[PDB]
Every structure is written in structure tokens, then in C-alpha cells.
Symmetry: C2
């Protein structure tokens, strides 16, 4: 994938309707079904403090950046076979760019 900066505003509404059910983004925010995502960019996968991951999410051990995040969110179980993130993917490149633009700022 090749991330290109998008709309944080549109990204925020995507997050609210496609991600929030399972994730929070704020520093010190709670784990839910999925891990709190504060500090996710620039950190290896499977390391949110206190969250119990699958073996696959741990073994992937990928340093999250805007490009491999875009690939992951296109199709999570293709990027991390054995994941337990029950999300099918964002099929539109503009959607991934908007979402990641928001997520970069929100999880900073």
C-alpha cells in the first residue's frame, strides 16, 4: 500500500462507525473487544499494555506505519492469518487514507 494524506474529519466518522465498537484511541483508554490503540504507530504489533493478543498478532511483530496499516485494514486476516479481529476490511483506498489520517493524530 501507499498511504496518502486524507481527511481527518472523514476518517473520524469512519472510525466511529467501523472501529469504535471494539477500540478506543485515547491515552489510558480502556481495552474492549480489541486493544486500546494509543501509540500504535511506531510500535510493534501485539504490545498494547495489558491486552491479551492472539499468537498470530504477536508473531507478526510488525512495526506499524501508515503503509502496512493500510494493507492490514484492507483485509486483516490476509495480513495476519489467525487474527481474531472480526473486521472484514476497508475496500476503498480513500477510506483507508482518511481513517489512517485520523488514527495517526488520534493515537499520537
Amino acid at each position: 500500500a501507499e498511504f496518502k494524506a486524507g481527511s481527518a474529519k472523514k476518517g473520524a466518522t469512519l472510525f466511529k462507525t467501523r472501529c469504535l465498537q471494539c477500540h478506543t484511541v485515547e491515552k489510558g483508554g480502556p481495552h474492549k473487544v480489541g486493544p486500546n490503540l494509543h501509540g500504535i504507530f511506531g510500535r510493534h504489533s501485539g504490545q498494547a499494555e495489558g491486552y491479551s493478543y492472539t499468537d498470530a498478532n504477536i508473531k507478526k511483530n510488525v512495526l506499524w506505519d501508515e503503509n502496512n496499516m493500510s494493507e492490514y485494514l484492507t483485509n486483516p486476516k490476509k495480513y495476519i492469518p489467525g487474527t481474531k479481529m472480526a473486521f472484514g476490511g476497508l475496500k476503498k483506498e480513500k477510506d483507508r487514507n482518511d481513517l489512517i489520517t485520523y488514527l495517526k493524530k488520534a493515537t499520537e
Copy 2:
């Protein structure tokens, strides 16, 4: 991964020593142990005419670009479990950037 343009000149030497054994890049160049790589950027994985790929590589169905190429070359079998490309990987980021800088140009 986050590709950054590097040295095409150094990339050519890296391709000679690490890839050429199994790959050609020229338009109409032969398949060898590995597929000819002409036009690889902007092609989906496993789709070059006349080459017999693994199911793994076909199923990955990745649209090759500079960033996912960089993740791939770091560790091919980790990115595409089941691939028959016998290559340990380019562990140095500058080496991947140089190689991909060369490869983008050479496969046009």
C-alpha cells in the same frame, strides 16, 4: 514499510549479487528459477504470463509497490508463507531502498 528513494547504482549491484541468479528484469527476459520481473510494480503477485507460481503467491494477491516490496524482501517467507522463493531477505533498510530504487526503474 516506508520506502525512500536511494541509490539506483548501488541497487544494481545488489540485484546482480542477490537476485539476478533467479530473476531477469528486461522486457521479454526469460523466466529462470523465478519469474521475469518486467512490469512487476502495478502487477498483482503471481500473474506474470508463462510462470508457474505457488498457490501461496497467487493467493496473496498483492498489488506490488515500493512499500510492500520492502516488507516482502525483508523476509519473503514471513510475508508470503508457502512461497518457493528461497531467499533469506535483505535485512538492511538502505539495501532495500537502494534495490527497490533500481528495480522500479529497471522493470519499466
